[PDB]
Amino acid sequence: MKYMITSKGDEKSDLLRLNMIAGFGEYDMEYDDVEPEIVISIGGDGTFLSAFHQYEERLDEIAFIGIHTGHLGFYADWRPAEADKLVKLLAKGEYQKVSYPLLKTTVKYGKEATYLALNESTVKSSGGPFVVDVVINDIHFERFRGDGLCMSTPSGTTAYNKSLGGALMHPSIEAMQLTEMASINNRVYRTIGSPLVFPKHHVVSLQPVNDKDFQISVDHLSILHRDVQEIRYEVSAKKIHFARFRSFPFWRRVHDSFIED
Amino acid sequence: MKYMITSKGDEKSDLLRLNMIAGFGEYDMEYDDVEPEIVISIGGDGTFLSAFHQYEERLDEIAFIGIHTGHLGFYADWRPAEADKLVKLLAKGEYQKVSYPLLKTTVKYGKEATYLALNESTVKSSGGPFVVDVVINDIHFERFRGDGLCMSTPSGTTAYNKSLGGALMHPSIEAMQLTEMASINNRVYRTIGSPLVFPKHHVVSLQPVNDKDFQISVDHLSILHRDVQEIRYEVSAKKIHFARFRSFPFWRRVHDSFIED
Amino acid sequence: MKYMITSKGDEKSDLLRLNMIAGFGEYDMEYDDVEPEIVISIGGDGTFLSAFHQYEERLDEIAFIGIHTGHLGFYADWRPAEADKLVKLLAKGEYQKVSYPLLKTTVKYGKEATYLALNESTVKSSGGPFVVDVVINDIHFERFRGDGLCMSTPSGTTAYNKSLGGALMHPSIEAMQLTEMASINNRVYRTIGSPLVFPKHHVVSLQPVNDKDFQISVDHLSILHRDVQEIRYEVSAKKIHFARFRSFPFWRRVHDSFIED
Amino acid sequence: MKYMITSKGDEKSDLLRLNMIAGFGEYDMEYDDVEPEIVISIGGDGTFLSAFHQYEERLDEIAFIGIHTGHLGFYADWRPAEADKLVKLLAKGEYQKVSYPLLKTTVKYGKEATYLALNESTVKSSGGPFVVDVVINDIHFERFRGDGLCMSTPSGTTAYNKSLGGALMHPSIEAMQLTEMASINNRVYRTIGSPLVFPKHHVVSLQPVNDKDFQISVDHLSILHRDVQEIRYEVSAKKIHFARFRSFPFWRRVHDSFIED
């Protein structure tokens, strides 16, 4: 199969990449970063995020693999000492795949721009106060007033969603979680406060009240959008496919990253 | 069909019950509180909880309906003014049903006792300090130290789970959420802190460390269990079936109860 | 005495201002917005904040008064219906004063800039990730990693400090409170998480780790500072003096704003 | 001076106690556990709590010292390796003292019982639902509905108060902090949610609404009180006096216990 390898850019990740290319050169494996069926990221979860968005147009044709040359990552979750064994079983093929849900973010202008997120998408205010009306399935739910909102993927719950008090969902649950950032709550302004978990086909809409410019982020990318009229959140029909080669449970992956290792 | 009606016991709930029995007497409807196919609770969510556990041995043969004579409830969510229209469309039959996930709680002794919960099951310490080892899918996850733990159903997320910082899940998501109660976290003792959402077939086990007596609650019921050896939490294969007669979205039901009405 | 009146700028606040000037014209009261001893703000807490920072160079010579033409404010906490009675007892003089603590914020460059805050001062990152070392009384306390930090005055605890989970302090306590914004906590990075309350003379220092550009806010004002080397927080020796004319307890003021009114 | 030493009861704490008595026997130091001026606790913070309440009738005549034979404590905060140096400088006298605020808890029946707490006092419900009206300085503040309340001393903020989201106050601030336990908040029932910090002479009163039986705890002690009519919280006029022998800042003590050591 075709393959390619991204690297964090530091010394050890580049050297581990060339070592796997040399190991791949001993098999029926052609290097190709244009039409690959296997994408390997070496470095961290951020390096994996770049590899995902780099090939987010062909998600159904790629099995992703992450190698962490630093601390353990939730996507780059295979030690460098297992690089040589990764190459062989990848070269055989006939491995099983695992798929995670993704977040679909739509932005409408007075024009439309859609995005896909592996971790989360956030909405903050371009300087001024952040005020939006939250619409769930065409029903007005609340008028949010604070620092912003964060809609997280299941696997993204361990990232920014966790710092905002959100819960950690197992990535086999096709859903999305919304969390609040420093919400103002007084006798006249009311937010739900609790994080919200939405199943598939549930559409969460954010609609402006005053300023129509929001700082919208999607994973690592963050762009200021002007004259915004609506932000639509829903579980994406597209999924990301990992190459499963051993057994590393998500809760074990959560334990090693936050409890002890 | 056979039917029965429970009442909160106050004046208006009893009078609304006799009015529906009289309205039911004008149809092919026999009253029977032993083998009913339709159970109506009048009062509040607590009155509905009693009706559920009263017929929790025959959940697949009953469509539940809740009427709130007081404030809006998440299970008793139909106004008394709609009692006369409930009777007629219930008498016709040919309504659609909706099903919610339930929580299965297993307790092992040096003997076994299983339970079903509509909202949540909690574990606290019988006087002394609460210490348990949390085991997720036979893998040790953490050693919890605090006031206790709460495993909530999807519909139960709006109850005790909400007061503990847990997220609100849509009841169409077959899952269960675990929350922490006043967990102690220092340089040597570590808990995850974030709430955890577990899909079906995921088994969460609580195992004692010192004292084997815990105050285990299941919905409104709470019993002190002695010489406890294991507490097993998992999404139940059994479900509760409501009688759907109009359109009352869960998020609309959340809005009316916490934001404004 | 000399006096001046600021107004929110809308119709009713301007008309209430001219009405008090006319009422003041019936006494030994000269209007002067350069050297006043009594400053009246009409509008809201934001209008009061502007009046404070407008005369923050002469705080020991001014008694402040706030009138809310909208909802109740914690500084603008006197109804417009009491405007005519405010004018008379202000004209008599011989009222008692009440004083609140202020926050002193120092910023050092490779040059020094000091500021005074009535509510709080916040530190966020200019685009990139926010990382600082927190130094309390010259002892390294923690390496913070997240969205930012907020040091609040006692009276400022009801503002942004409250949205960040901070506690509400009575303004008679000469202290300052620090709160965290979306702090990242994993097995390798650790923050205290709890808000911290510091007495007088306690100096809290924030020191950069990578980027030396921070978005530093002080009350409503927010300015991007570049090549920052240190941010020093401490309870200010200066205080703000209100003109006490009735009895409005802080906890009563908290009750009317968040519980019910 | 007279002195006495309490011990956790395990082997090393008893042996360290007899070693200090033998070291004290080489000075003008008489052992006396009835009228001592110096009390030494060996073990942990719990052992120190027992020593405090054991001599809480003569707090103005005693300088307390805590030795931790296990992990670092906030009261037992001197290593066993410094036991021999503690004995000598204690025998010289002429050390400086440091004093911490205490919590005064009053309970009224249809009779009165007062208590002193070094960490905190908690109020929970004897089985049924916990509902109280919170009265601050004779003004009704809120109707609390949840699991209970916790009023903490400044030094007690690092204990149970920290697990409940409360802030950490420096013990030089004569104040008390109130925190909420799993408070229920819906459209009809409202709590402040934020922790509250009260200065001296501020009296916080809890008054029953239905059940007059509460599980009231004071530090380690916990007693069920029946037919309760009022619970009064205020900063105590009495203080605890430690024997200062080196320099161990409270924030350094917080750092070593929660961040790293």
Ligand SMILES: [N-]=[N+]=NCCCCn1c(Br)nc2c(N)ncnc21
């Ligand atoms: N706030 N904040 N947090 C930033 C986390 C950055 C590292 N990181 C990435 Br990039 N993705 C994940 C993920 N899915 N889970 C956990 N950490 C992750």
Ligand SMILES: [N-]=[N+]=NCCCCn1c(Br)nc2c(N)ncnc21
């Ligand atoms: N802590 N605490 N909270 C007690 C809530 C009691 C009322 N109540 C019942 Br009973 N069941 C539900 C439910 N599913 N959602 C919301 N309120 C509910």
Ligand SMILES: [N-]=[N+]=NCCCCn1c(Br)nc2c(N)ncnc21
């Ligand atoms: N986040 N956020 N919150 C902004 C609050 C703005 C209104 N406001 C002002 Br301006 N000052 C105070 C104060 N001291 N207490 C309460 N509200 C206040």
Ligand SMILES: [N-]=[N+]=NCCCCn1c(Br)nc2c(N)ncnc21
């Ligand atoms: N929940 N819960 N937490 C129990 C803490 C028990 C140990 N411990 C004692 Br006993 N007193 C203190 C104190 N003042 N600070 C920190 N830990 C303390």
